Amino acid sequence: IFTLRPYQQEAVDATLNHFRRHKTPAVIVLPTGAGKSLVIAELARLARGRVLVLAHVKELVAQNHAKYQALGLEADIFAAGLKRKESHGKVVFGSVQSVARNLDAFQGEFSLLIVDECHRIGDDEESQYQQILTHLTKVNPHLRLLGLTATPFRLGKGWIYQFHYHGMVRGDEKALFRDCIYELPLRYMIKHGYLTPPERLDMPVVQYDFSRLQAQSNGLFSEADLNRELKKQQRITPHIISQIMEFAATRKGVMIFAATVEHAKEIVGLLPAEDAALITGERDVLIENFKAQRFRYLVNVAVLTTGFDAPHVDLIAILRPTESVSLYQQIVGRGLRLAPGKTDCLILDYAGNPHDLYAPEVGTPKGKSDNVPVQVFCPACGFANTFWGKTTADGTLIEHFGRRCQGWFEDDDGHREQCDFRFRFKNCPQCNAENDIAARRCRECDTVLVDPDDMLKAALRLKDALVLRCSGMSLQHGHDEKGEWLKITYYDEDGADVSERFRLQTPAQRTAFEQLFIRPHTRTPGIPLRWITAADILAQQALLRHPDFVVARMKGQYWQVREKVFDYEGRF
Ligand SMILES: Nc1ncnc2c1ncn2[C@@H]1O[C@H](COP(=O)(O)OP(=O)(O)O)[C@@H](O)[C@H]1O
Ligand SMILES: [Mg+2]
Ligand SMILES: [Zn+2]
Ligand SMILES: [Zn+2]
To answer: Which domain, by its residues, includes 248?
Structure first.
């Protein structure tokens, strides 16, 4: 009694093809509710020896075992508190702690290791995980390792894999997994009826202003920063909860996603007495009480409970800002389990989060809250990159902060490489090769690339050269006998200024202008500025930025601009 949905057969096929050509671990990205047990079952059926499904969380180990056996198949379990029964079946489910101390039971053939929730590996039970890995690779030197996760990306931690099979890089060489070989988007499950569809309320009455907040190192939000502005706007909290109650009269189950513990307890109070509970992050804490509708409301703070299956949840109310589209999708998905008569799950966002469940995950920290995902084509390979940026109403790009194309390619010989097109770069002083902005040594000639502070410090002390911190630039143009020209004047807050001039008459002059001024100064690298006359440059000065520092050699007529520091991070 097992036939595979098309997307499940695809995940199996992707795994077989990968390991028939490679030894390296790979990861599959599946959302909850996809039916991971069916993929495991068919992989085990085709396997030599046995298959081990390992998981850090013992609670998850027991669920996977349950769902697998519910397919009409047999398996062992190695979890704490359980006793070794008659070993039966081709699959073994276990936890990192239990397996790492019952390693004497794994002296047989294990051809495949499936690690569920593989995004946790860098967090906990790391010594024991190496213990399991060392033992399995000495018994099975050709063992294959498949990762499963619904959350490949975590803010502050990075991506779990480097190469995505659709043609883009996500992590760098430090990524735990070399490859993501299959991904099932949440959009596909909703579109094809594998999950209940969400329906977000378009116009909430009042919502929190969460734009002024500045993220910490991780890109996350501090509890204190969230609380500062929650208490600034706490006269809106009564009104938002009032409408949640109004919507809940037409719904069945209600989850509330609050920002802090201070915010939650306030929320529970405004809710009807005995009609609301709370989920921190002891036990089930009334998990099946909620599913028996002992209470209509269940508030939750930054704690995701693995395994929650509540088809009765008809309503999700998000009152916390979401730092990532991926976090928003894990929150929404908890109310998308199918049920008869459940036409949708109403989503009530009162935090000002964007209205796009299917937005692309940039995968890098935002920086400024007004930035949005923007699409930027690579001039070299044509890959459609997605960077942080800003647009007009029509969608016309104003700025984008991408630095390198994220595409990769692999040649017939099997050699793989990321696209080398660099939207932002620095030239090597010796060989002129284009290098990453952060590089300390040239990639082609290994010459030292001077830090911005050090070059400035030498010219700041040695005043034979001029140094100027730039607050902005002004543009001027005219027309002499050899043709048009454009003069740029760089100035500081105290009025000192350095100027440079570009002629614009000859083809070589125009080419040099684009090479030396536009492409460095442009706000949208990779999208050429269209221009005929110098006045066209002036009209489009919004698309240009000014350097943060200007260094000029105090020589020539008055000075000759030599260095320009863009995107400066350091002393000043
Ligand atoms: N090929 C299939 N045929 C019939 N039912 C399926 C199939 N694949 C998945 N399902 C059903 O879809 C649901 C998957 O939910 P769940 O087991 O929680 O997925 P996961 O374990 O990946 O979170 C289960 O109710 C399961 O019976
Ligand atoms: Mg399953
Ligand atoms: Zn490219
Ligand atoms: Zn060089």
So the answer is: 192-349
Give the residue whose CA is nearest to atom 5 of ligand 1.
35
Distance 36 CA to ligand 1 centre (A): 7
Q: Give the Cα separation of 92 and 109 in Å (integer).
A: 12
> Are the beta carbons of 436 and 403 closer than 8 angstroms?
yes
Q: Do 278 and 136 reside in the same domain of the chain?
A: no
Between CA 214 and CA 220 the distance in angstroms is 9
One-letter amino acid at 137 equals T
Tokens 């298959």 sit at which residue? 51
Q: What is the CATH number of the domain that holds 160?
A: 3.40.50.300
Best of 4, 9, 32, 184 for a ligand 1 pocket test (most atoms within 8 Å of beta carbon): 32
How far, in Å, is the centroid of ligand 4 from the Cα of 426?
Answer: 10
- Return the axis-axis angle of helices 58-69 and 36-45, rounded to nearest 10°: 70
Q: Are residues 16 and 161 in the same domain?
A: yes
Ligand 1, CB within 6 Å, residue ranges: 3-5, 8, 32-38, 67
**Pairing state of beta strands 483-491 and 26-29?**
unpaired
Nearest CA to ligand 1 atom 12: 35
The residue assigned the tokens 């040695």 is 462
Residues surrounding ion ligand 4 at CB below 5 Å = 428, 430-431, 433, 442, 444-445, 447
Residue 230 and residue 185 share a domain: no
Resolution (A): 2.0
Whether 144 and 29 share a structural domain: yes
Distances (CA, A) of 40 to 18, 180, 344: 16, 17, 30
172 and 287 together in one domain: no
Q: Does one domain contain both 177 and 315?
A: no
- Tell me: do 89 and 187 sit in the same domain: yes
Residue whose Cα lies nearest atom 1 of ligand 1: it is 4
After which residues are there C–N gaps above 2.5 Å in the chain? 281
Q: Do residues 258 and 120 share a domain?
A: no
